Every structure is written in structure tokens, then in C-alpha cells.
Amino acid sequence: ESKSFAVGMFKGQLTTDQVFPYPSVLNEEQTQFLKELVEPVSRFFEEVNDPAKNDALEMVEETTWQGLKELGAFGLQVPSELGGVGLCNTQYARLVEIVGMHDLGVGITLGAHQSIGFKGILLFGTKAQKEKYLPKLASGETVAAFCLTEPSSGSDAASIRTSAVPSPCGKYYTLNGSKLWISNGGLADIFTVFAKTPVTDPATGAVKEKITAFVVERGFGGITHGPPEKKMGIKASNTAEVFFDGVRVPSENVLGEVGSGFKVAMHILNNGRFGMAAALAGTMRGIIAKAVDHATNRTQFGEKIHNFGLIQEKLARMVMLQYVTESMAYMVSANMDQGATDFQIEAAISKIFGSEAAWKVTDECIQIMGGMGFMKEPGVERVLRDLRIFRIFEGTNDILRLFVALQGCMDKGKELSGLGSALKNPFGNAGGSGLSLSGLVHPELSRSGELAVRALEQFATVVEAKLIKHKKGIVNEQFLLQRLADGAIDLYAMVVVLSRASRSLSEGHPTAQHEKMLCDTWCIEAAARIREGMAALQSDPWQQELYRNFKSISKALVERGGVVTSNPLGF
Amino acid sequence: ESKSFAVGMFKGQLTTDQVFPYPSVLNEEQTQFLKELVEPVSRFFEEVNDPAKNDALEMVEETTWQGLKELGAFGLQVPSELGGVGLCNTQYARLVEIVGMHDLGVGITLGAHQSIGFKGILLFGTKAQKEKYLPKLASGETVAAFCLTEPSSGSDAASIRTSAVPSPCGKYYTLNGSKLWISNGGLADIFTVFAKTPVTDPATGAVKEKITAFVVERGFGGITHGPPEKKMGIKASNTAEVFFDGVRVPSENVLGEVGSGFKVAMHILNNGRFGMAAALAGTMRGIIAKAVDHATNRTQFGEKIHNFGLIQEKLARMVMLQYVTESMAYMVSANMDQGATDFQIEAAISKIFGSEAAWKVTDECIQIMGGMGFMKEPGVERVLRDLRIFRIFEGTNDILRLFVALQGCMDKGKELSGLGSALKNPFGNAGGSGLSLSGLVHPELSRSGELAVRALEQFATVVEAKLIKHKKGIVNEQFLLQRLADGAIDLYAMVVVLSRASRSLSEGHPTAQHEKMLCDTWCIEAAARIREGMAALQSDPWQQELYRNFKSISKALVERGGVVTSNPLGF
Ligand SMILES: Cc1cc2nc3c(=O)[nH]c(=O)nc-3n(C[C@H](O)[C@H](O)[C@H](O)COP(=O)(O)OP(=O)(O)OC[C@H]3O[C@@H](n4cnc5c(N)ncnc54)[C@H](O)[C@@H]3O)c2cc1C
Ligand SMILES: Cc1cc2nc3c(=O)[nH]c(=O)nc-3n(C[C@H](O)[C@H](O)[C@H](O)COP(=O)(O)OP(=O)(O)OC[C@H]3O[C@@H](n4cnc5c(N)ncnc54)[C@H](O)[C@@H]3O)c2cc1C
């Protein structure tokens, strides 16, 4: 049985192995080594990098770029014996939180390189591939890029058109295609490329086109790139089209198994996903400091504005979002470091949650700052511009919601359809829930623990009813799936903060009473959202009218090409 | 008694004079004259103005600027006999919807000039002031600016420090101060300036400092400005500090009455406010066309994406927001044109609603577009950058919510405190709601009309209970006031669309059944938000715990200077 909390909750089970107690993974030497890196990495971003300059120049300044290579920042998770820093996922999370606090354009360049660009070599490379490629990737002598998206294919990776055709000898493949919006596409010398190949069925020999992943060197020939694309934010990161024209790729440069490229791509994206939430937890930490500074020092209506309830509630909401996001990021990284094999729903939740949280936190920082927040000099508007893409790339949040909902439903649907389905033998065959977090949550958080268990039961009841009603047709019920994904996001958020705050209380940390407050305040409102949301799905007699009207209104818009009504004057 | 719907709803009354039937104000000649302007103004924005170029140059191109003057666009509401186009508020709304659809940087420059910059001359000018100043304002030979904000004072206008001191003869005032973030500050030759003056009490002679408004000419001497400030969006608009150093202002340049400058400022802002919603209804119309075009033509997962429910719901929500905003804008403009004196709550609602709606619509257009939406070339990201300021200037939306809530409570609180308060004479003194929209809403919208009446009753019940509980101390209950303002916004939104769609049904317009659908879909969810929101205020036993925790969490953040917790590792 799965050890995933998210898998269990869709079945009405409390599977807590990967949640409680809040995981601690580093040994004493790993902790001290990480401390000795945090200091120089922080100083580098404080004293050498200039995020406003990189945004103005639409590139990373050369002194910063070379300094990052010397710091080891292009190879943080590459083993030391292969030229890297040798960090585990939790150690990586700690350093990317520094990068995300300071410069998301630098962060995307380093993440595109190592979180996804060569990550497939770390996960699937042969010994020969690792030894050949990793040392120069880790030094930054060869930058990497993840080459999946094409003009025709973004969310639907299975539809890619770039092709790789084997030679008669089988010594190489000829690769033809183009890729779109590739981070580092104009800088990279190593590309992880996904392309359709003919794959021979091992039993019958029948040939079917399937995706295969390849390690491609720019020096193989036939590779060019377009100019840097101009964009709203993360302007220091390079984004370019990459063109492959008759590229000879050696057969030993297949990454993983021929015809398993889709799984390779998905595993790379899943594996890298926690780093987003970690970086964005850092973004939020720096933004909250700026908002608090402003509210501490601005007088209006005769008081400093932190004395006004509207500002107090904005600040409290911002820190709860940062705390949830940070807690999710380090939970997933710890699960990975502890050998979890089923964390993909939790990782997707962390990416949706953290990207939307950082957006909302930075938008409210602008609001607290007033007119100043819209100005260029304070730098907050630059962060807001940078953040908009994080809801779109590495999986749009809309598609990730559908993934969360359907992946969570999958095992429950398997169980339900197992019911019945045995043949009947007529010839004489002889043959509350009890759920509780007591003993896992700290006693001072018992009430919020009970809110989480009740919300889990409400959620699982709706999941079951909807799978019985829709069966395999649930895949087409998108209004429903988005609402189930939101319930799942809030439920995981509740248990992550219950777990972290409980450990803080048990260990007597100085901030434990504050963390208990963050947790209870989060849980009261998250439990209300799950209660109201699940009632709308199950017992609301107007919900189906809303769904029919969303479809009818959208159809009317598409027929017209835009708004159907004129203004009230009619012209 | 007030004819305002918003005033009535806080008292549990249905005051419908300014709502039903949806107002029609233009006579046949005004309609034809407006049609003859819509065509050349639209062509000018389609064929002459280039919004991407003005954003790149951080100014309005000279050919566009001169063309706008020749079009009459600097004087749209100035009477023809004073050199303007002579439009009423509804006619103005129609043309600013064109500007807002095409270029919000141009829109803010023209609005800062005429919606607020010289608007006080139209509202309060003497005959001599109007004849002297309006002709060159209307031609654009003299650009105007509204000079209220200072480094110390934004939301709290009463706290301004710029001073104007009368001469011994009383022939002039000497003006000293500085103003911050003034739209057109570096371009204007006419400034509406708010400054503190000594004001003599007419009965006793005692002198008190109060604000006075002045018409100030750049040529009076002593006026300089700072360089254009760089900002996230509306980059074509000029924003500059304005400095007043020993400026001699003739006494006949007082605008309105000495010591009534705060009221003048507030009346100017209130009077101009509907133009924001009108412009932003146009912004949303153009953005919805772009989103619909994208969803019509993008194939993913084997279908055009408008076939997927997630996209259908996003599109349907976007058009409902555009329709509500547009309907509010033309309702308020019509009320003004029909001589309403009490429309300030409705105008503030329209500004909060329309600015937040346009932000949300444009953010979702980016999401529908995927990666393309983050790129510069499509132009959507530029619109999103432009829109962020509209939640802040002309009154921050947070302060406008407090205004809506407290202004609505004011007459109800007056009524309640009248209860009792008569002396008792012990010596022998002898001496459902019924509310319905039936007959006002169209019969096909009767159910949504009943939802609105029930929501009004729920709202008014809470307003009464909270005024009894808090009395004059309600001014300090900001968490509550923000939630009451949200209820008021949704209630006005419901009645505005019920009124517009009812007229469409009664008149048999071709889009009436579609409008009925927009209205019912809006009303079902708005009624649910008011039901749940009012229950949280009245009958929820955890609401007070949330409020206490928002204050405690914010206090802990201010004490620390930022997030209190470390990350889970503790360093
Ligand atoms: C700055 C930048 C950097 C990038 N870096 C890289 C990189 O390094 N490597 C890489 O390979 N790619 C990269 N990308 C591409 C990025 O991952 C894609 O933009 C993303 O996957 C979305 O694809 P799309 O833009 O084609 O949108 P589409 O997939 O066409 O989606 C359009 C919209 O429809 C929705 N949608 C799609 N299908 C469905 C469905 N079945 N049901 C409901 N809704 C649906 C989507 O959520 C979205 O809202 C980058 C993009 C940008 C902008
Ligand atoms: C591009 C631009 C153009 C502008 N154009 C002009 C112009 O032409 N003329 C002009 O006069 N001004 C103009 N302004 C100034 C603008 O109106 C002010 O920025 C606005 O009034 C807010 O004031 P502030 O920035 O001082 O914020 P503050 O008033 O200091 O507010 C800071 C924050 O605290 C909140 N807040 C304040 N008081 C309270 C309270 N009592 N309770 C709860 N919350 C509170 C606010 O809502 C905000 O979130 C412009 C500004 C910009 C950025």
C-alpha cells in the first residue's frame, strides 16, 4: 500500500508515514556543511549580484555569472566525485530559498540548468553518461536546457512532433524539429531533447511512434537557436527557440529506454518540482520583510499603519501563506531524501500552492506600500513581474489541478470497480470512521487536528460519490475536478502545518506558540473552505445550473469572438 | 429621504429610484452626436496611437499627442461655448471606454487632465474662472494636474502640509510646499492645488488651519517639477513631484470657499470616479476578445481548448466581471446626468469592483494564453502592468471599502441612536419584511430578484446588530468593515445586473436571453457569498478568534521585522 498521505486521503484513509512527525533528514556533518555554504551563497547575493541590473540588461551580468560558476552553483546536486557540491534535496532546498529570496531570474537560469536541464542524467544516466557529462555541467562549462515544448505542444507533451529516426546500422539517430521557449536555449551546450522515435514491440515487432529522451551536444552539428525572447519578467533568464536540423545523435546518447521518453520527462519535472516551492518560500520571506518595514514606519491618519486592522490581516495572511509553502517544500524534499517513491501529488500541490501564494503575497505587498509599490525603485514590481510565469511553466497550474484530482481518484476508482465484477456461481458456493490524529498531533493542536480529520472525511465522501456517479467519465468533469483539487490542496496544507507546528511544540522551540497560532488560524479557514466546497459539490441544487451556464456562456462568447453584449447604449 | 440604493440597503430598505428601470438618459440628438464621435475616436486609436510604442518610450508620441488635441479629447465635458465637446457623463463614459480598451497610459493622461485636474473648475468655478481657464484646457494648450498627495499624505488628505498664507491686503496668498506622484506634474500649466490656510471663524474670529483649493498657473512663478518617475505600468503617463516655492496666488484663484478645500477635493474625486469603471469595462472588452481568440484557435490534447471546462469557466467568469463593471459605470453616469445628489457609495463600489475585475480578467487572459501570455509581443502583460495602479490611486481600494461601510452605516446609526434619548416625563404623559422586487425585475428574473432581496435582508440584519454592539466604536472594527463593504459590493452588483438584464428582456433585445444567463449565474454565486459572509459575521463562533489572531500574528511580525520562524532547519 502507498505511503502517500495524498493517495490515502482520496480513499478516506489517514496515511501519515510521510507527514508525521515533521521529518528531519540531515546528519550532523550534512548540517555543518550546509551552514558553511549558506554563508558564502548569501554574501554573494547580497554583495555581488544585482537583481535590478540583471533585469535591466536582460541577462546575468558577467561577473555574477562567473562568480556563480566558482561558487559551485551550477552543480549543487552533482556528487562530489563527479565535480559537484554533493547536496541532497533538503540541502538544495535551503540554498534555492536564498536564490529565490534575491533573484528569480538567476534562479530560473540555475534551475533550468540543473533542476530539469541535466536532471535526467542524474536520474537515468548510465555510468558512462554520468562520467562523460556531469563534470562540465557541474562547473558550468556546459550549460544545460530541457527541450520539451514546441509550437504545437506545451501541456500535451504526448503530441510533440520533433522526430528522431534510427540509422540502418543503429549507430545513431537523425533528429529534426524545433523547440519553443527553452530556458537557456541560447546558452546551452547540452540539451535533454524529447523526440518521437519508431519503437519495435519486443513480442510482435510491430512499430509504433513513442517519445524517447536524448542527451544532445551542441557540437554534434545542425543545432541553432533564435534570439532571446522578450518577456514580462525573469528578464535575466535566456528564453529561446532551439532548432534541430539533421542532427546526428549517437545511439549511446539515448537517456533511459527507447520509447520511455514521456516517463523520463515526467519524472524529471516531478523530481525538480519541490525546488519551486523552496525558492518561492524565500521570495515570500524577503517580500514580507519589505511589507513589514513599510507598515512599521509609515504614519497615516495619525498612527503607524501596522496599527490598523486591514494591514494586520494582510500581513497575517501573507505569513501564513509563506509558512505553508515553506513547510510543504521541505516536507517533499525530506520525503524524497528518505526514499519515498510516491510523492507526485504532494509535489504538484506544493508547486500550485507556492506559485499562487507568492503571487498573492507580492501583490499584497504592493497594496500595503501604496503608490510606492507601483514604482520601479523599490523593486517589488520587478518581483511581481518575475512571479507571473511560475503559475505556467513546469506544468500550468490548471493542468496540475487536473493531475492532482485524477491521480488521487485513480486508486479509489480501482477499488470501487473491483466491487462486483467477479462472476456469480449459482451452483452452490458455500464460502464513525475511527480516524484520529490523536498521538500524532501535539495535544495543544488537538482541535485543529480534529478539523483536519473531519475535512478529510467530507472530502473522501464526495470523491467516492462522484466516482460512483461518473466512473471513467470523471476525466471529462473539469469543473468538478478543479474543485476537488482545491480541496486536496487545502487538506495537504492543513496536515503539513499541523505536523510542523506539532514538532515545534514537542521540541519546545522558541517560536512554537507563534507556530501554533499560524496553524490554528490556517486550519480554521481551510476547514471552512473544504466544508463549503464539498457541500457545493454534493448537496447544492444550483451547482449543476452553474456548470451548464459556464458552458453556455463560453459557447456564446466563442460564437461571437468576444463579449456578446454591446454597452448599454447599443453602439 | 435619500434616493440612493446603497444608502437604503444598509437600513434594510429597497430604494430603487436610481436603479430600476435601467436608466436611459440621452435624447435623439445626443445619441447621433455621440455616434459621430465614436467613429473618429475609434479610428484614431486603431490607426494613429500605438500603445506599445508609448510604453516603450515612456511618453505619448508627439503625433498622437497633437492628434488628441485636434480630436477635442482634452475637453470632452467642457461646454461648447467654452471651447469643449460639450458631452454629458454618459457620453463621456462611452468615449473613455474606447480609450481604456486601447491605451490606459493615454487614458490616465487624459483623465488626470480632465476627470480630476481641472474638474474642480467645472464643478466650483465662478463664471470668471470658467471663461478665463476652460478654453485653453479644452484645447490642450494648457494641461492640468490634480495636486493633492504629498510625501507625508496620501490616503489621509486632511494631513497635508503644503501651506498658503494670505497677504496683509488679502490680494494674494503665498504658497509653499511639495506634491508627490502627480500625474501630468511635469506637463501641466494649470494645477488644482490643495493647501492649508488660516480660516477665520465668521462668528468669533478664531483662526483654524483648514484646507483650501486653488487654481494655480505655472506662470505665477516659483513652480518647478522633478523628472518623470519610472514605474511598472502606465509608462506613457507623466508622474512627477511638483514644487511650490514662494508662489504668489491671486485671491480670486481660490476655488470654491476658503476652508472648504477638503470637500472640493472629495467632490472632484467622487465626480470623476465613474470614468474609471467605464474605461476598465473597455479594457476588459478588448482583453476578453484576445482570450476568446486564443481559446478558439489553440489545439491541445486533440481539441480546441474552448472545449475544456476549465477554459469555459474562466471565460464565463471574465465576461460576467466585464458586464457587472460596465453596467455599474453607466448606471452611475446616468444617475449623475439625471441630477442625483447621493451616488458616492455607488461610485466607490464601481471603482473598487471595476479595478479588481480588470486585474482578475487580464490575469486570467494570461493564464489562458499559457507561455505566450507572459511574452512581450502579445501586449497582454503590458495591460496587466498598467492595471495594477488602478487599485491604488483615486483612493486605495482598502480605504474605499472603509468609506463604503462607514458611509452606509451612518444613517442607520443615526436612526438607532435616536431611539430613546428623549427625556422621560414621569408626571403624567398621556400621548416578514414585505420587501419585493416584483414588478421591477422582469418576470423571467423573479428568482434572482428574490435572491437579491433575501441577501439585502441578511446584510441589513448584520449592519443593525453590529451598530448596536459597537456604536461609534464601529469605526475601529476594520476586519468587520472590510467584510461589510464586500457584502455591499456584491449586493449593488446583483441589483445592477438584475436591472440591466430586466430592461433587455422587457425591450426584447437580441442578447436578452444571454444577459438573463449572465445575471442568474452572477446572482447565484453573489447571494452565496453574502449568505456565507453574513453568517461568519453574526453566528460563527470562530470569527472572533480569527480577528484576535490576525492582530497577534501581525504584532509578532512587526516586533521581528519580518517572518518570525526560520525555515525547518533553523538556520
Ligand atoms: C519564460 C518561459 C520559459 C520556459 N521554459 C521552458 C523550458 O526550459 N523548457 C520547456 O520544455 N518549456 C519551457 N517553457 C514552456 C512552458 O512549459 C509552456 O508554456 C507550458 O507547458 C504551457 O504550454 P503552452 O504555453 O503551450 O499552453 P497550452 O498547453 O496550449 O495551454 C493553454 C491553456 O489551456 C489550458 N489547457 C491545456 N490543455 C487543457 C486541457 N486538456 N484541459 C483544460 N485546460 C487545458 C492550459 O492550462 C492553459 O491555461 C517556458 C515558457 C516560458 C514562457
Ligand atoms: C502612478 C501614480 C499616479 C498618481 N497620480 C496622482 C495625481 O495625479 N494626483 C494626486 O494627488 N496623487 C496621485 N497619486 C498618489 C496616490 O493617490 C496615492 O498613492 C494614494 O492616495 C495612496 O496614498 P499613499 O501612497 O501615500 O499610501 P498610504 O495612504 O500611506 O497607504 C498605505 C497603505 O495603508 C493603507 N491605509 C492607509 N490608511 C489606512 C487606515 N486608516 N486604515 C487602514 N488602512 C489604511 C492604504 O490602503 C495602503 O494600503 C499617484 C500615484 C501613483 C503611483
Residue numbers in the entry:
A (entry chain A), B (entry chain A): 29 to 459, 476 to 615
Would you copy out the relevant sentences from the publication that reported this structure?
Very long-chain acyl-CoA dehydrogenase (VLCAD) is an inner mitochondrial membrane enzyme that catalyzes the first and rate-limiting step of long-chain fatty acid oxidation. Whereas SCAD, MCAD, and LCAD operate as tetramers in the mitochondrial matrix and share considerable sequence homology, VLCAD is an outlier that localizes to the inner mitochondrial membrane as a dimer and contains a unique additional stretch of 180 amino acids at its C-terminus. The unique C-terminal region is comprised of an α-helical bundle that lies perpendicular to the enzyme and further includes a non-visualized region spanning amino acids 446–478 believed to mediate membrane interaction. Point mutations in human VLCAD can produce an inborn error of metabolism called VLCAD deficiency that can lead to severe pathophysiologic consequences, including cardiomyopathy, hypoglycemia, and rhabdomyolysis.
No secondary structure was evident in this region and residues 460–475 remain unresolved, and thus highly flexible, in this structure generated in the solution phase. Of note, the crystal contacts demonstrated a reciprocal interaction between the outwardly projecting MBR of one VLCAD dimer and the surface groove of its neighboring dimer, consistent with a stabilizing interaction for this otherwise exposed and disordered region. Taken together, the X-ray crystallography, HDX MS, and liposomal translocation assays indicate that, in solution, the structurally-unresolved portion of the C-terminal region is solvent-exposed, conformationally dynamic, and essential to VLCAD interaction with cardiolipin-enriched membrane. Interestingly, the structurally unresolved portion of the C-terminal region (e.g., aa 446–478) is predicted to fold as a helix-turn-helix hairpin based on sequence homology to structured proteins in the database.
